[PDB]
């Protein structure tokens, strides 16, 4: 029973984000996973990496993904770095201190759009959810919150602290205005969706789905519909997918940043006529974002990220005519850390060399101590990779069936057998003393290798019914296991391949096979999503654990004892114990699915290749009706008094919170009450309270629409109070009283006389009709 | 013409046409009545023209103007319901209610009614403008209303408005129209008795603030 | 005449008189007329 918890993170050039640029070129911000890279481009060195201060598996952590960084921005000028991440939390870094100083949280979604004016000390954001909302730093809380789109928001843009324009998923255009603070004008920007949006002072631009991309202007005339928005440009042809970011440039240009690994640059002097195609920018792979550093209008400097992990910078002359240049100049590439692609093969020496493999055969060599890449070597598709402990080489098995092997100090090809098996060769294992090898290969072919002094050569193969996935070998060099691709685990006695026993019951194939020091326990996982542990003895089923949602990927054991770690598809990780084969940890650490797992020789550091370029080392160590009446009664009364009071001269917190003059606050309260209560309540009330009423009623009656408004309740309450209290209240004698009485008795007729009126009315002009058409078109 | 949307004549004398990758039909046309012989495309303008048994020909042409007068009617609603609430946050009770009925938003025409009362409450019955506009009104916008207007009357809260559009109706109207209209007779009969109901409510709450007078005269008499 | 649901597929009447549209109600709106005709028609 320990505790261990994640130490690195290897790879993680070009997650999902905008990059953002800096002068010094000068360096540029990008996303890593649940953190944030910076670097200078002539270097190509992280100068800092912004990460949270729990390790994820810790005890506090929480099992869930951590939220990816999606989107980030930051001012200069003040230094300030805001950062919203998938889950809709949006924190912001300051980069001297490199530590956060407040947090939000207003989304229920991934965050799409980041700006903010430092000069108005206001983030604004708008998120995967429709809504745009409006936070201020000094006041560290959201002003308001914007929402009148239904998909997303794609497109953003802002001017002042006055207006807004906002793009959505939902092909609609919206301006807004901030003081009247509402959405005000619409239009209907493209048949589908909405994406790319990027305004000039003057005319802005917007793109939809199929390089259909609209040019239309600006002003603040103050017709209802015109003036606000138009449609005079339709520019198109720029390419066959959809746009997805535009920005100016001017010292006079633009670019359109495009998801067929295109950006297209456009110089501004119908949609011709105003228009000018600059040039396009091609990379070979597929591209994410961009932003422009241009000096004098002579050159011009360009910055984009990948979907792998490549950071592509770009450079061109030219003289305000020409772009000077068939081809940009790709002055500046940041991988050498990364991979280009999905890794698929991790392994570890004694010395703690580490290894990674992936589809361009770019084998590459880390070190723990150092973080940073040994060395790298290209041999294409190669699934598998292994280590020879004499003189620490590595050997890989590929899709095409070849089979390679590079040493860590001299070149690559030291021998290459070619056409190892017709079709894939699909894993390989080495004897524990390193002079026999074993191949599973595609071919449902099982090829025994020998290391002559260097060379290979297969002294022996063997043929099976059915294709092959993996292959496993003692550690104690007895038995051989193979995973075939029906449900099938057999284990030989290596010495001489006998069959010795057979296992099965996975209902699907076997992904991953291991067995302990001792050569007795062997632990299989499928795709079953349920791992099973056997003993060997007999080829009995111990036990079968469910777990890893989607399918266990990968299993290894632990050198000291039956501990195993369990990787999935799911991205989790859980280390389990097999003699109480409970789970006694559950990692979380990242995102996608966890290809490759390799743990240490004796350490217990594992590392587990994700399928989002994830390398990880892990370590170890209540009131009552009328009572509210009275109540509400007591403070319009006093604000009423007090008022009046006021008047004379020149002759509440609750009030000013809820923003309502006093009577139409008590009319409330005689709404909320509910009638079965209302009769008891209006004979609770004390008198005193009853002739406050009466001076309630008066005031309305000086205000008549809220008379028209409510006329039955208020004819009702008042006549039920005078029906009760009558005897006391013309006992009572008050000539104000009189006059106030008075009052109630010629407005209440007058209002009651005017409904009696319009009712009469209708229902006489409507029987005329009935009986005129009844006598002329009824026989 | 389009290589993808491949026609199909038939003898039942009909024509049917569908997207070759599709598998489904997808438009029929039956212009023909007894059989269908001869049928020919012209391609750089994809016209179909068909001929049947008799002596009757077809000629045919698919267009996109119908997508165009879609998206067109697309944009203007969109336009319009901007309007609508624009208007109601600022005023123009008129406008709110021309492009509520061009709508037909129950809510939305129901509460501009109510504020039109309630501005109105300080012969005219509305704003004047609000007025001619009901005057103006159509005939399936009169039935429209009035329809809502027998709705709003079945409740008992909002027979205020319901009455005080009916008014304004009979006083800007012309009753031969009104009763010509179809229909309006039913809806007026279902009007009338809730109209009544109403009257005979109103009457009572008169008659109570007579009691109030009462109180009144006592109190006097012993002051 | 009692009042009963509207004819159009764009609006929903409720029984004491009041005509809703379907699309003019905000999203709230919509969930919430939602959740209530949901425990009418899971109590009949």
Known sequence: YQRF?????????????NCVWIPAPGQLITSALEDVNIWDIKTGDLVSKLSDGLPPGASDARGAKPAECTYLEAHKDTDLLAVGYADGVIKVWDLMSKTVLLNFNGHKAAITLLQFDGTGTRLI???????????????????????????????????????????????????????????????????????????????????????????????????????????????????????????????????????????????????SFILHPFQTIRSLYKIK????????????????????????????????????????????????????TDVRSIDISDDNKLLATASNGSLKIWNIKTHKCIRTFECGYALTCKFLPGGLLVILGT????????????????????????????????????????????????????????????????????????????????????????????????????????????????????????????????????????????????????????????????????????????????????????????????????????????????????????????????????????????????????????????????????????????????????????????????????????????????????????????????????????????????????????????????????????????????????????????? | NKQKQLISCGADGLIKIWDCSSGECLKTLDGHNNRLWALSTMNDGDMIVSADADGVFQFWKDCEQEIEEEQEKAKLQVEQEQSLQNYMSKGDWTNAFLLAMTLDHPMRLFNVLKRALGESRSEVIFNEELDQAISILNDEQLILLMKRCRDWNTNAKTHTIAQRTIRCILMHHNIAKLSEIPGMVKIVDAIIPYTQRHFTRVDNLVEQSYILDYALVEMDKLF | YNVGKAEKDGEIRLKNGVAMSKEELTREDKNRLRRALKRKRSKA
Not at chain 1, 5 to 17: D, Y
Not at chain 1, 320 to 333: E, F, G, I, W, Y
């Open chain 1, 5 to 17: 918890e994640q130490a690195a993170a290897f790879g993680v050039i070009a997650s999902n984000a």
């Open chain 1, 125 to 271: 954001s708008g998120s995967k959810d429709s809504n745009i909302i409006v936070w201020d730093l000094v006041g560290e809380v959201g002003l308001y919150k914007l929402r009148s789109h239904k998909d997303s928001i794609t497109g953003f843009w802002c001017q002042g602290e006055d207006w807004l324009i906002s793009t959505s998923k939902d092909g609609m255009i919206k301006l807004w205005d901030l003081k009247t603070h509402q959405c005000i004008e619409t239009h209907i920007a493209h048949t589908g969706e909405c994406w790319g949006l990027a305004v000039k002072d003057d005319l802005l631009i917007t793109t939809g789905t199929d390089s259909q991309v609209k040019i239309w202007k600006l002003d603040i005339e103050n017709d209802k519909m015109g003036g606000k928005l138009t449609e005079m440009g339709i520019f198109e042809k720029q390419s066959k997918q959809r746009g997805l970011k535009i920005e100016f440039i001017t010292n006079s240009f633009f670019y359109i940043q495009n998801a067929d690994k295109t950006i297209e640059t456009f110089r501004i002097r119908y949609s």
């Open chain 1, 289 to 340: 974002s961009a932003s422009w550093t241009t000096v004098s209008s002579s050159k011009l400097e360009l910055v984009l990220t990948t979907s792998s992990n490549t950071i592509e910078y770009y450079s061109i002359p030219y003289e305000k005519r020409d772009p000077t240049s068939p081809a940009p100049l790709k002055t500046h590439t940041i991988e050498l850390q990364g991979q280009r």
């Open chain 1, 399 to 779: 899709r095409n069936g070849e089979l390679q092997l590079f040493d860590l100090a001299s070149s690559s090809l030291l021998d290459t057998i070619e056409d190892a098996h017709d079709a894939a060769i699909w894993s390989l294992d080495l004897t524990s003393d390193g002079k026999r090898l074993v191949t599973g290969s595609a071919d449902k072919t099982v090829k025994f290798w020998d290391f002559k002094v260097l060379k290979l050569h297969h002294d022996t193969t063997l043929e099976l019914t059915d294709d092959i996935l993996c292959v496993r070998v003692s550690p104690d060099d007895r038995y051989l296991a193979i995973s075939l691709l029906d449900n099938t685990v057999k284990v030989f006695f290596l010495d001489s391949m006998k069959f010795y026993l057979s296992l099965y019951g996975h209902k699907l194939p076997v992904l991953s096979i291991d067995i302990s020091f001792d050569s007795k326990m062997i632990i299989t996982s499928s795709a079953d999503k349920n791992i099973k542990i056997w003993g060997l003895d007999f080829g009995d089923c111990h036990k079968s654990l469910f777990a890893h949602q989607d399918s266990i990927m990968n299993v290894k054991f632990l050198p000291q004892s039956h501990n195993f770690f369990s990787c999935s598809k799911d991205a989790v990780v859980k280390y389990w114990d097999g003699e109480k084969f409970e789970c006694i940890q559950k990692l979380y650490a990242h995102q996608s699915e966890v290809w490759a797992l390799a743990v240490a020789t004796d350490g217990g550091f594992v590392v587990s290749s994700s399928h989002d370029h994830s390398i990880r080392i892990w370590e170890e160590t209540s009131l009552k009706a009328g009572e509210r009446l009275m109540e509400a009664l007591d403070l319009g009364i006093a604000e009423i008094e007090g008022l009046e009071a006021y008047n004379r001269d020149m002759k509440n917190a609750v009030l000013i919170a809820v923003n309502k003059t006093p009577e139409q606050y008590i009319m409330d309260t005689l709404l909320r009450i509910r009638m079965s209560q209302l009769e008891d309540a209006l004979m609770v009330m004390p008198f005193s309270y009853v002739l406050k009423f009466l001076k309630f009623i008066d005031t309305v009656m000086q205000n008549k629409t809220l008379l028209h408004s409510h006329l039955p309740l208020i004819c009702k309450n008042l006549f039920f109070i005078i029906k009760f209290n009558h005897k006391e209240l013309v006992s009572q004698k008050n000539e104000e009283l009189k006059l106030q009485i008075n009052r109630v008795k010629t407005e209440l007729r007058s209002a009651l006389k005017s409904t009696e009126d319009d009712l009469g009315f209708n229902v006489q002009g409507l029987k005329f009709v009935k009986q005129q058409w009844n006598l002329r078109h009824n026989y």
